[PDB]
């Protein structure tokens, strides 16, 4: 599914309000992007994470 693999954070369902306040259901999807995380110099899996989790990994010196 369109969800993170490190965390479980997924899509966010809400309303699409326009002029005249017409209601139409819409879905916000997470910015899923591919990244490779080294683990003890091995198993460089090409995991699919969000950009928020990618920033967390970057500031943690690629720790997960």
CB of 6 to RNA, least distance (A): 12
Distance CA 48, CA 45 (A): 9
Sign of CA dihedral 47, 50, 53, 57: positive
Residues 6, 37, 51, 64: which binds RNA (CB under 7 A)?
51
CA angle 32, 37, 42 (to 5 degrees): 145
Binding string to RNA for residues 7 to 46, with x set by CB under 7 A, is what?
A: --xxxxxxxxxxxxxxxxx-xxxxx-x-x------xx---
Residues that bind RNA (CB under 7 A): 1-3, 9-25, 27-31, 33, 35, 42-43, 50-52, 54-56, 58-61, 63
């Amino acid at each position: 599914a369109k969800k993170d693999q490190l965390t479980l954070r997924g899509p966010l369902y809400g309303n699409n309000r326009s002029h005249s306040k017409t209601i139409t259901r819409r879905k916000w999807n997470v910015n899923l992007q591919p990244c490779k995380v080294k683990t003890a110099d091995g198993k460089t899996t090409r995991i699919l994470v969000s950009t928020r989790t990618l920033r967390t990994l970057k500031k943690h010196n690629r720790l997960s």
